[PDB]
Subunit: 291 residues, 2 copies
């Protein structure tokens, strides 16, 4: 069911916070874990000591995940350890700004680390699994856990870049799920909240008992990641989960709110205008595509 | 109401196809139109003659919309013409490939033209409108019409790059709508289908109006560019043929809540595996054929 013994996972952004917790959690479930982050961050991290304590083998590979060489080395490292079973794309940075103040660099940096980084490693893994399945019996074990956000669903006012990257990640994940399904590989997206040193500004410090868990502990997220990494999740593909606390929300696809169909084979501009204007004039203010 | 006389619009990817059609449509409604596309494409286009024929002023600005200089020149040009009222981000390219065969170049090119191009011009317009409202009475006329796609909702197997760019665009649009609302500006996204030289491969040749005429899309763009759409902000519209579909936000399908203050891994596993046991493989976060 959940045993990952004999499997190799790659986790990005793993020196600290959620990625660190994911790497440790996969190690506890039995996986050999390849951890990636920026070199300085890896150097100060206890992640390898914690993977060892968890009873597994860990290997660190430094690099900027937005660069092709990094995703190449991660897959090569995994192959040398006996194969690649699990990819967790977690690496990210924020560069928040309201749109009218955002610089080109703030936009580009966020798109590169989140969206290009997710692309490079997911594409590399996809190519690897396709080749492995071709050399074998047409199937291969594989799991992709990608990291979206509620921001991709809501387009926050201070996060046009991060919202766009995260919405792109969701669509990339859906496409990956379609491409990989027939080989037995599954790909899904999570949208987590968890209290870490990076999110301390947003969530505040840890509250309050023997046995109680922090409502925003990384533990809550890791438990889902462990499932999504495991044979148990064979029936789960192309899904988006929101996760924090003792609660996992499976998100439903967008639907049609209203169809506006002309009487004839084309809308007269005046008729469509009156129709839409009059529909919106009697409709809720906050209601739109934002979730 | 619908009259765009006295207003200045900028349309990207305007040499051909949908962008050309949108530029002509805004001109017909009364706007002065600044058209942008790649140099060679603009040089060969009839778009300026068609704008002139619709009875309006057109000006061509060549440039790669993924490069900062282009968005800068577009806003400067519109300012020289009296102001900037309407931005239609339409420029785009496809580089389709299944994910396991997609090159870095194929991915990056699509992200650049669609997502960066949309960012650069929407950000430049956002800055312009914010400044214009500050210098005036705190309000300014503004409309953004951005171009997403049903691909952003479905994540097509052949289009991981295009799907990601178009989903990105929708989120960018939502954020712009939140940032600009208070100045009176409105921003919305469209997800069109229309038969053009570029979509001839997929849709076929033309067989009363063509069910996939660009006219169907242009009619909605005219509304979204106009005073009539003051009440429309942060929306996603699918449009083709005589039908416009307003898209609703995602909802929660199912909440899986632990009995205690954390899920036991084995408990969450059995719960989720049981829930997915007899599931239609098509049921997921992908949305398809919402017009139907």
């Amino acid at each position: 069911d959940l045993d990952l013994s004999g499997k190799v996972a790659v986790v990005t952004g793993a020196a600290a916070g959620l990625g660190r917790a994911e790497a440790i959690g996969l190690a506890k479930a039995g996986a050999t874990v390849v951890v990636n982050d920026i070199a300085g961050a890896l150097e100060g991290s206890d992640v390898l000591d914690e993977i060892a304590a968890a009873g597994s083998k860990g290997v660190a590979v430094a690099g900027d995940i937005s660069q092709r060489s990094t995703a190449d080395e991660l897959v090569e490292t995994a192959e040398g350890l006996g194969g690649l079973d699990i990819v967790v794309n977690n690496a990210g940075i924020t560069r928040d700004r309201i749109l009218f103040n955002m610089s080109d660099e703030e936009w580009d940096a966020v798109i590169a680390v989140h969206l290009r980084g997710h692309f490079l490693l997911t594409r590399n893994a996809a190519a690897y699994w396709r080749s492995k399945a071709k050399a074998g019996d047409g199937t291969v074990y594989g799991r992709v856990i990608n990291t979206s956000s509620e921001a991709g669903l809501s387009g926050p006012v201070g996060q046009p870049n991060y919202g766009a990257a995260k919405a792109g990640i969701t669509a990339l994940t859906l496409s990956a799920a379609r491409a990989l399904e027939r080989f037995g590989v599954r790909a899904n997206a999570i949208a987590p909240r968890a209290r870490t040193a990076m999110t301390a500004g947003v969530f505040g410090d840890a509250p309050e008992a023997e046995g109680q868990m922090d409502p925003l502990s990384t533990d809550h997220v890791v438990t889902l990641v462990q499932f999504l990494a495991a044979p148990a999740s064979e029936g789960v593909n192309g899904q988006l989960f929101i996760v924090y606390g003792p609660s996992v929300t499976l998100v439903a696809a967008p639907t049609a709110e209203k169809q506006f169909v002309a009487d004839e084979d084309a809308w007269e501009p005046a008729d469509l205008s009156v129709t839409l204007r009059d529909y919106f004039a009697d409709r809720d203010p906050e209601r739109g595509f934002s979730a």
